[PDB]
């Protein structure tokens, strides 16, 4: 949104096709296609659906997505280097993927993600509530220094659940028992077990 | 991974300077028949025709694989097209000049 | 001699009266258009790459043959004849005439529901929390954006659903079809159970493009088991055309300029063993359950399943509902059908709470005791 | 005849060997040749081989790599999996019935006898089953006597205590 | 969860082999057993006599004392390890309080050392079920089971082996309350328990009596053939 | 998984205690309600055979002379349990010339009601209702398998122990007297049987401070029954 | 004697059945067929008088159809005419008659009706009322207005006549058949069973009202093979895809679904409950008494002497079924063509059932137990 | 007909002519089997199982009306156990060569099924090729071939038309094929196959030599009694390899110390003691 060069976009599984070679068509013709457009910024995700650590076995194996992924790594980086590429790439999980697909500098800055500690949890419910009608009768920290653990999207859910629970009533803007309930929801993952604890 | 296995290569490809043909051995197959089984012909008659040539295949593993009981039928041909470097890398007629320069990622 | 007569003379008189009738036996709706349709053209169609600057000079596969620079005929509109938009081209000339929406699937259109089930919220009685955050979720916004816009609040475009076998989830998604006013389309979790690698990738592709063309529709996922589980990691390579098409599901579903105005209700029977990509909030907001009707709700559920029946008016519901705790509303349904039924083994035509008690008595005991079957005491 | 056993022992070696010191006409055939471009190729090709051995002698032909033929799990769906088939069976139709006099001697050979069909060892088919197995401790003794002939061989190095 | 072992639960509660060694029983040998008022009396079936050797050896009623009489069910060796133990807990109870061992006693006992031999760390349960009759306080005539588990059950009639359903099913029809004694007619009772026998072929029947004060006699392939043809004549006056 | 008692849960728990809470389940249901003139008592018997003679199956059993119980599952690990009791409180009796008082009956019983283990066996499947008069008048004593003991003041067991419990909680409260809690107590158990209440299916054990002995009802059951 | 009349009626039959211009204006809609009438399939249809096809290879035209036979014959999903002069969809094509249809879609009311049970008479009734009611006479539900009961399963030892009542209820009908054998439900393939799935009750559901009768379905959850791909983790998808079929959405349809176990154990709690099933069915092994029904139906058409009383063959064994006395018959017919002779004797009917009650019910070497 | 090929013109697509030689299907399944043919003069040594497979399948065939006239039902699974290499397929082969019936060896492969149908869905287009071929004989070999077979014999049993449509299965290892499977009226005749005896050996060693040329003086029980119990195609490559021992010596007689060498070459199969234990 902010940045304006050619940005481009791609998913895993879509990569991945039903013939053999595709995929070696489809990456070698999107780094050309980015190529020629030179302040080019790749963006990739879930990179873990094509990458993964391969397996030496008898009687099964799924092959294709290697070669995809190989594809990707060689054409990427080695032999013809390039300069003008920028990587963007996004997984959920880690250690499913091989050491060639970073290395070092396959990929160079490796850039963990953390949670909202405590601040940024009422600095999200503030962003997200920037758009509702509040009437502010309402400590964000008090939120946030309850709430424990919760991603951006769980107090997204927060901020919204809290509307709707506004309008439960329907009466008026926001109120404080509103995020409190929207919590309340949030929360669980109910138990609620309880036995053999006395 | 990581030791600089390609650079080495590409080191002999800024010294000897002759006939690099670097395969990078992923973008051979494109969906059909027998096209790289022709390519595979094709590169070797290459090869044998301008002598000094150097050969050499990056990531092999992919089109190498080891062998199956007979699962997806793609790895039908991706073993046909093996086999095929397998008789004509010795065949009968022996290659000459024709030095394989190899790489992987896990042997 | 007496039935081998009867059989082979009469069969012979059969026969012989057939042999006699083997000897004794020895427009203008349209056609005039076709012939005026004759003149009319063969109009195969194509496939687009791209366009050129300046002038047209379009370069078209058809699908199979070569490919052409062609040039329109002159009777197009020559704006709309984008890349990718498959399009009808002359046979000699190869001229380009009128743009037709492309290919959908062979068999994935063939999961719109093109008609609209008469279940009803009346029949879904005792989930009235359910019933109102479903009215909520997809009634409300999807028919009357009243209260959401107006203020400036979003609606929840994710809903899932879960809980005891035979709770009416299928009775809540068949229940919204009957008011749905909305493009609704059935996936069954095990659609994406094909042969081929990357093809459930397309499936996904086609479900949203389906989606996203004709406005304010609705998706429903089913037993979404089958469509994966978790992101198991082992070193023989498993679960993996489920999983790619896991994760394209969950990408095609939201993110970089996500769905738009579809509202998707997925259901399964084995919630704990889902991965957090789904469960995370924003592709999945209200983590609406079920619970067993533990109340009133069941006498509810006794007069749904016999309201449409003639019955004795000196009856009572709540009995019964206290004889079934753990029941779930497929077990009453089996048990009101079952009295009607031994009702039917008579000849009146109005029931008894005696046929309930035949019924009770009857299912619970015969099939929810003898399978499995004890013959041992050890407890009591 | 066939050939199979640890591969490296030699199995292209003694058809080495036995062409250099044959006599009659001698084909070699890549097991991964009949696979090509053109949609019916194969047959024909079978033809040429089966049609030219019955034409020249009581000749040989060596066919290495007959696993690239040899594949007992087909897909009759994928297409490219059908004229695999269709050449097995061109191959089984032109085994049985040559002439039972034309001394045709065709030797097939893998390193793999997994993925061969059960109906193609058969008597008539392949008789014999030809293992080239590992050597042993003096089997590598002459091995070493016959190829360090070449080499110069300072003489009081002694190869033996390596075997 | 699993048919293995005897010591974890099922999901919903049960014991597998707890369940599953009640069906050797239940393919076993059918041995039947009533109470008569003065005199007990009962019997196996399938003496299965194979033409060539001798059958004193797989008498399957035995006794433990002079007052209390077996039978069992299921295998034969757990059968043989049982009461050559309540032999000798028998004989250590008479040197114990010098009473004739009551039935009761030695049912706990039975029914006891099997069920701490079911709980232990991996040893087979005994697949028997045993017939426990007796008649001790006053001629008092008792009869209790036994179980895989190891719970003593006290019956009035007795009907395990092959086919346990029907066998019982026919005392049902047949236990009235005049039944004994009424000797004659306890006699009859288990003449009319042998003829509704799974197979009833008239020599394979094997029945022993007591009388609560006598000792345990062995009866005579003459008498029951008599027996026999009286139920004929029973049948025949029926029509 | 789960495959053993020496393993917990990620999230818990036993897991082989579940299992056994489970195998509560499978046994007839009992009724003991604590009322100060005294606790009455009640159980199934859920009798097969006509041949299954009736007074042989034990669920009420005494343990003291003022100390009643009753069995729920398993019968030989109740009987086991039982037997424990009957010594323990021999010696209670022996070492001090009194009466062990319920509550520390139920904790004798309870130590080793979990000592399971089969090295250094299995968990036992019963629970048990306690019923007794101590010093402090009378006293209802509910355990679980699992060692949890608590007091309860109507408890219920079981099968089809929700609704008695449901229809219990319905009809409780803290000033009932003997014989009004006697048939609130068989309207529930003939509410949640199958068969026709009779003399044959249920019994009674009735202990009172002044009549301390007898914890029982015997044929006089019939006229409480043909009340209702 | 009566091979004349069978042979004759046999010629006749096939010679009658062998014994299969005026009109103008259809031989004008002739001329207007092609003589090389081609043949396609479609893809998509336009409301404009055309709409598109397909070729053999792949090319795809918008041709337009000749309007006397109607285009609601026309599905996506069929064969159709084309020309080859402007390859216009020139007719409706009867369909590809598949062997799913030739195999499954039994034509044919196989054996002996009603009178050929062993035992029953409550489940018949059961049966009938919940299969032949709902679909002979449902005047019923109009008279109330209930649904009709929807599955049942057939459960017992093996050779109860699961079999039986299979074919009973395939004789007494009037709506298609389908029959599938439950150990089918496995390929050499990843995601073949769902395909089978869809593709079999898509069939089912296409035609008219119809029973579909499955038979030992136990043999997919406590079955294991070499031969398969996958695994659990593909047999679930298997039973998942079934359990959305057969309870799913859309007004399943007038399609009774009707299965058959031997053993119940082993099954799905998610696939025994109603909705999906709502009448489940014992077979025990009924009674000692039904022994002598099945003696008398299973020799009502063999010349046997009296010189046996099925008493006799009441008192040797305790587990009954049609599995013993139809083998008690062949074991006697095989013992009467051994001696040569008819009107079977008692001797046959001892050695048969010595030898039937060996083979097969003893278990195990002795001794267990003895 | 139903598929067969005519003469079509090209221009006008007008049927020109019948083209004959049609397709032979099973024919070419039987080309992809090339099963050993038999007749009754190889099997000798035994004729037990012969007069048994005799009395159960061409009474069959030969005499319906036999079965008929008493009104039985007549016997259609043959299940047959026994080691290899004692006949197994031998015997069957020899029975539906001498009653014509059309013999099917089904084992296990994408050829097969290519031919039975496309390899679409199922194998019971089998039974497409068996009624309309009625005199069939079908055979298999030794879990997925027992479920093959579950399925054929779930439908041919009465839900079906006119016999002479009789499978044979023969393994080893009874016990682990189903025991619902042989449901007695399921599976009627379990024959077994014993190893050949010394006279039996004898038997088989005259036809197996009989045809090959020998020395002008030779004896047979010693060499019968030199086998302690063979297969019976081992008794075959012991004369062939007494042939191949007599032309290493550059003749064409066949003398005892042939043998003498051939039951050393073939006894390698067992030896291997301190391993008497039991
Ligand atoms: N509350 C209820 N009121 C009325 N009918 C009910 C109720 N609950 C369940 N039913 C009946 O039970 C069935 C509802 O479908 P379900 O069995 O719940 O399908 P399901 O919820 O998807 O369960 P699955 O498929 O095992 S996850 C229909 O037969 C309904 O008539
Ligand atoms: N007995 C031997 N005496 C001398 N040299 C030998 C001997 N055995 C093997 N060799 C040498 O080792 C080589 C054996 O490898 P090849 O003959 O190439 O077999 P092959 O082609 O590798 O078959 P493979 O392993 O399936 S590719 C020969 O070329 C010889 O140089």
């Not at chain 3, 009867?6 to 012989?16: A, D, S």
Request: hydrophobic share 40%; glycine share 6%.
């Amino acid at each position: 949104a902010q940045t304006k060069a050619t940005f481009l976009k791609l998913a895993g599984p879509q990569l991945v096709q039903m013939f053999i070679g595709d995929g070696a068509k489809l990456v070698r013709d999107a780094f050309a296609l980015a190529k020629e457009k030179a302040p080019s910024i790749i963006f990739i995700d879930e990179l873990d659906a094509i990458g993964t650590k391969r397996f030496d076995s008898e009687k099964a194996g799924d092959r294709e997505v290697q070669r995809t992924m190989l594809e990707l790594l060689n054409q990427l980086d080695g032999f013809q280097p390039n300069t003008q590429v920028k990587v963007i790439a996004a997984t959920n999980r880690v250690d499913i993927l091989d050491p060639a697909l970073l290395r070092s500098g396959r990929l160079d800055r490796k850039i963990e993600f953390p949670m909202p500690n405590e601040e940024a949890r009422a600095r999200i419910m503030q962003i997200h509530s920037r758009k509702m009608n509040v009437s502010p009768d309402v400590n964000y920290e008090e939120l946030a220094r309850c709430t424990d653990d919760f991603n951006g999207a769980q107090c997204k859910a927060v901020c919204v659940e809290a509307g709707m629970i506004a309008l439960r009533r329907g009466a008026t803007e926001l109120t404080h028992e509103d995020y409190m309930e929207g919590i309340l929801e949030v929360q669980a993952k109910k138990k609620a077990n309880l036995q053999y604890y006395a | 991974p990581g030791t600089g296995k390609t650079l080495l290569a590409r080191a002999v490809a800024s010294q000897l300077d002759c006939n690099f043909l670097k395969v990078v051995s992923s973008s051979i197959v494109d969906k059909y028949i027998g096209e790289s089984a022709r390519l595979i012909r094709e590169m070797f008659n290459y090869a044998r025709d301008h002598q000094p040539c150097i050969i050499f295949m990056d990531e092999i593993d992919a089109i190498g694989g080891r062998r199956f009981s007979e699962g997806t039928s793609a790895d039908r041909e991706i073993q046909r097209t093996l086999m095929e470097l397998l008789n004509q890398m010795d065949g009968f007629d022996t290659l000459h000049r024709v030095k394989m320069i190899m790489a992987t990622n896990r042997p | 001699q007496v039935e081998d007569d009867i059989q082979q003379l009469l069969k012979k008189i059969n026969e012989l009266t057939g042999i006699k009738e083997s000897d004794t036996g020895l427009l203008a709706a349209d056609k005039q258009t076709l012939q005026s349709e004759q003149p009319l053209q063969v109009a195969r169609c194509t496939k687009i790459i791209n366009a050129d600057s300046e002038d047209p000079k379009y370069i078209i596969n058809v699908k199979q043959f070569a490919k052409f620079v062609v040039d329109l005929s002159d009777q197009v509109a020559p704006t709309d004849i984008e890349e990718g938009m498959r399009v009808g081209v002359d046979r000699n000339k190869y001229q380009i005439h009128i743009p037709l929406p492309p290919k959908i699937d062979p068999t994935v259109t063939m999961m719109q529901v093109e008609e609209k089930p008469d279940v009803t919220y009346s029949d879904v009685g005792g989930c009235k929390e359910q019933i109102e955050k479903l009215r909520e979720v997809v009634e409300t916004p999807l028919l009357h954006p009243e209260r959401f816009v107006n203020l400036g609040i979003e609606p929840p475009k994710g809903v899932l659903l879960f809980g005891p076998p035979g709770t009416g989830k299928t009775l809540c998604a068949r229940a919204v079809a009957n008011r749905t006013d909305a493009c609704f389309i059935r996936v069954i979790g095990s659609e994406l159970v094909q042969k081929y690698v990357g093809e459930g990738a397309r499936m996904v592709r086609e479900l949203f493009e389906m989606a996203r063309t004709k406005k304010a529709c609705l998706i429903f996922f089913d037993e979404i088991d089958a469509i994966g589980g978790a992101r198991f990691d082992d070193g023989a390579g498993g679960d993996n055309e489920v999983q790619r098409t896991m994760l394209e599901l969950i990408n095609q579903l939201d993110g970089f300029d996500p769905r738009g105005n579809i509202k998707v209700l997925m259901a399964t029977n084995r919630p704990d063993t889902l991965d957090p990509a789904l469960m995370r909030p924003g592709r999945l907001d209200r983590k609406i359950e079920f619970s067993l009707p533990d109340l009133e709700g069941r006498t509810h559920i006794f007069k749904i399943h016999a309201r449409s029946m003639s019955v004795e008016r000196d009856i009572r519901f709540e009995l019964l509902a206290r004889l079934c705790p753990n029941s779930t509303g497929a077990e009453i349904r089996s048990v009101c059908t079952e009295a009607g039924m031994f009702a039917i083994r008579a000849r009146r035509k109005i029931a008894t709470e005696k046929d309930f008690l035949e019924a009770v008595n009857k299912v619970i005991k015969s099939y929810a005791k003898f399978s499995a079957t004890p013959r041992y005491m050890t407890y009591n | 005849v066939l050939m199979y056993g640890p591969p490296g022992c030699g199995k292209t070696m003694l058809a080495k060997a036995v062409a250099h010191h044959t006599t009659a006409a001698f084909i070699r055939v890549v097991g991964s040749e009949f696979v090509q471009k053109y949609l019916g190729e194969g047959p024909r090709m079978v033809r040429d081989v089966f049609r030219l051995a019955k034409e020249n002698a009581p000749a040989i032909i060596f066919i290495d790599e007959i696993d690239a033929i040899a594949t007992k799990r087909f897909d009759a769906q994928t297409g490219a999996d059908r004229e695999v088939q269709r050449i097995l069976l061109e191959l089984l139709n032109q085994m049985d019935g040559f002439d039972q006099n034309v001394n045709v001697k065709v030797i097939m050979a893998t390193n793999r006898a997994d993925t061969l069909d059960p109906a193609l060892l058969r008597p008539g088919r392949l008789d014999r089953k030809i293992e080239f197995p590992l050597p042993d401790r003096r089997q590598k003794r002459l091995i070493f006597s016959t190829i360090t002939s070449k080499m110069n061989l300072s003489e009081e190095v002694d190869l033996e205590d390596y075997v | 969860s699993y048919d293995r072992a005897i010591t974890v639960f099922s999901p919903d509660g049960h014991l597998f082999q707890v369940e599953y060694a009640q069906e050797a029983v239940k393919k076993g040998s059918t041995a039947v057993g009533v109470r008569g008022r003065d005199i007990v009396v009962l019997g196996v079936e399938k003496k299965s006599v194979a033409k060539l050797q001798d059958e004193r050896t797989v008498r399957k009623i035995c006794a433990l004392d002079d007052n209390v009489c077996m039978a069992f069910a299921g295998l034969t060796a757990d059968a043989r390890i049982v009461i050559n133990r309540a032999r000798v807990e028998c004989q250590s109870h008479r040197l114990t309080v010098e009473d004739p061992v009551t039935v009761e006693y030695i049912t706990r006992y039975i029914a006891s050392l099997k069920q701490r031999y079911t709980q232990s760390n991996g040893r087979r349960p005994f697949g028997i079920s045993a017939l426990i009759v007796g008649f001790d306080f006053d001629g008092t005539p008792r009869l209790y089971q036994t179980d895989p588990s190891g719970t003593y059950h006290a019956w009035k009639a007795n009907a395990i082996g092959r086919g346990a359903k029907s066998v019982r099913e026919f005392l049902e029809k047949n236990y009235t309350d005049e039944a004994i004694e009424t000797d004659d007619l306890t006699i009859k009772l288990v003449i009319k328990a042998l003829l509704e026998v799974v197979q009833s072929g008239g020599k394979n029947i094997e029945l022993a009596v007591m009388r609560r004060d006598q000792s345990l006699k062995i009866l005579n392939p003459e008498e029951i053939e008599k027996y026999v043809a009286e139920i004929e004549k029973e049948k025949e006056e029926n029509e | 998984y789960d495959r053993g008692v020496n393993t917990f849960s990620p999230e818990g728990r036993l897991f082989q205690v579940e299992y056994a809470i489970e195998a509560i389940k499978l046994g007839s249901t009992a009724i003991g309600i604590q009322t100060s003139e005294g606790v009455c008592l009640a159980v199934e018997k859920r009798i097969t055979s006509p041949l299954m003679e009736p007074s042989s199956i034990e669920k009420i059993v005494e343990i003291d002379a003022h100390i009643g119980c009753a069995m729920s599952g398993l019968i030989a690990d109740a009987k086991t349990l039982i037997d424990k009791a009957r010594v323990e409180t021999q010696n209670h009796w022996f070492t001090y010339n009194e009466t062990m008082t319920v509550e520390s009956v139920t904790q004798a019983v309870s130590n080793l009601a979990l000592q399971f283990g089969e090295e250094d066996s299995r968990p036992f499947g019963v629970a048990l209702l306690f019923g007794g008069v101590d010093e402090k008048g009378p006293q209802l004593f509910h355990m679980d398998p699992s060692g949890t003991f608590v007091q309860c003041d109507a408890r219920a067991i079981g099968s089809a122990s929700e609704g008695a419990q449901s229809s219990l909680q319905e009809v409780y409260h803290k000033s009932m007297t003997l014989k009004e809690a006697i048939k609130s107590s068989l309207i529930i158990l003939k509410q949640v049987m199958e068969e026709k209440l009779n003399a044959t299916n249920i019994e009674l054990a009735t202990v009172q401070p002044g009549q301390n002995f007898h914890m029982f009802t015997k044929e006089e059951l019939e006229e409480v029954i043909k009340d209702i | 004697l009566e091979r004349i009349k069978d042979y004759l009626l046999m010629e006749e039959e096939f010679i009658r059945n062998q014994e299969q211009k005026q009109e103008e204006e259809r031989s004008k809609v002739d001329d207007l067929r092609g003589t090389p009438m081609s043949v396609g399939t479609l893809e998509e249809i336009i409301d404009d008088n055309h709409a598109i096809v397909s070729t053999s290879v792949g090319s795809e035209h918008y041709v337009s159809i000749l309007s006397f036979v109607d285009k609601d014959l026309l599905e996506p999903g069929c064969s159709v005419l084309l020309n080859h002069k402007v390859h216009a969809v020139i007719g409706v094509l009867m369909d590809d008659t598949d062997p799913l249809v030739t195999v499954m879609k039994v034509e044919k009311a196989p054996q002996e009706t009603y009178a050929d049970i062993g035992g029953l008479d409550n489940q018949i009734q059961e049966i009938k009322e919940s299969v032949e009611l709902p679909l002979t006479h449902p005047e019923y539900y109009e008279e109330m207005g209930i649904k009709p009961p929807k599955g049942v399963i057939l459960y017992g030892p093996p050779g109860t006549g699961k079999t039986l009542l299979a074919k009973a209820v395939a004789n007494q009908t009037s709506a298609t058949f389908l029959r599938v054998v439950g150990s089918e439900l496995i390929q050499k393939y990843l995601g073949d069973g769902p395909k089978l799935v869809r593709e079999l009750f898509r069939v089912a559901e296409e035609h008219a009202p119809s029973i579909v009768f499955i038979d030992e379905i136990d043999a997919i959850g406590t079955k294991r093979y070499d031969s398969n791909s996958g695994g659990e983790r593909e047999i679930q998808r298997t039973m998942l895809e079934l359990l959305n079929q057969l309870d799913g959405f859309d007004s399943r349809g007038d399609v009774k679904v009707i299965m058959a176990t031997n053993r119940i154990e082993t099954l799905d709690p998610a696939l025994i409950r109603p909705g999906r099933i709502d009448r489940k069915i014992e077979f025990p092994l009924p009674d000692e008494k039904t022994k002598k029904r099945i003696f008398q139906i299973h020799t009502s058409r063999m010349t046997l002497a009296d010189d046996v009383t099925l008493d006799d063959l009441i008192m040797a064994k305790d587990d009954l079924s049609g599995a013993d006395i139809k083998a008690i018959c062949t074991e006697a017919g095989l013992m009467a063509l051994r001696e040569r002779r008819m009107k079977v004797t008692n001797e046959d009917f001892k050695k048969s059932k010595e030898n039937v009650l060996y083979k097969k019910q003893e278990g195990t070497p002795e001794g267990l137990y003895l | 007909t139903p598929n067969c090929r005519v003469a079509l013109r090209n221009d006008s697509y007008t049927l020109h002519k019948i083209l004959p030689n049609k397709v032979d299907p099973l024919v070419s399944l039987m080309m992809v089997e090339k099963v050993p043919d038999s007749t009754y003069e190889m099997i000798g040594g035994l004729d037990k199982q012969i007069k048994e497979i005799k009395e159960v399948i061409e009474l069959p065939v030969k005499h319906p009306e036999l079965f008929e006239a008493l009104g039985i039902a007549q016997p259609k699974g043959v299940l047959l156990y026994g080691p290899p290499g004692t006949g197994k397929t031998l015997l069957a082969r020899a029975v539906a060569h001498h009653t014509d019936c059309t013999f099917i060896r089904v084992s296990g492969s994408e050829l097969v099924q290519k031919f039975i149908g496309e390899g679409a869905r199922m194998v019971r287009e089998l039974f497409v090729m068996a009624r309309e071929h009625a005199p069939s004989i079908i055979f298999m070999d030794e879990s997925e071939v027992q479920r093959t077979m579950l399925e054929l014999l779930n439908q041919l049993d009465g839900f079906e038309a006119t016999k002479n449509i009789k499978v044979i299965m023969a393994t080893n290892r009874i016990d682990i094929l189903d025991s619902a499977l042989l449901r007695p009226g399921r599976i009627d005749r379990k024959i077994e196959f014993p190893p050949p005896n010394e006279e039996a050996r004898l038997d088989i060693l005259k036809i197996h030599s009989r045809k090959m040329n020998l020395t002008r003086g030779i004896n047979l029980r010693k060499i019968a009694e030199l086998m302690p119990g063979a297969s019976g195609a081992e008794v075959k490559g012991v004369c062939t390899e007494a042939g191949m021992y007599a032309l290493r010596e550059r003749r064409v007689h066949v003398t005892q110390e042939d043998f003498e060498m051939a039951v050393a070459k073939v006894m390698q199969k067992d030896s291997e003691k301190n391993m008497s234990i039991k």
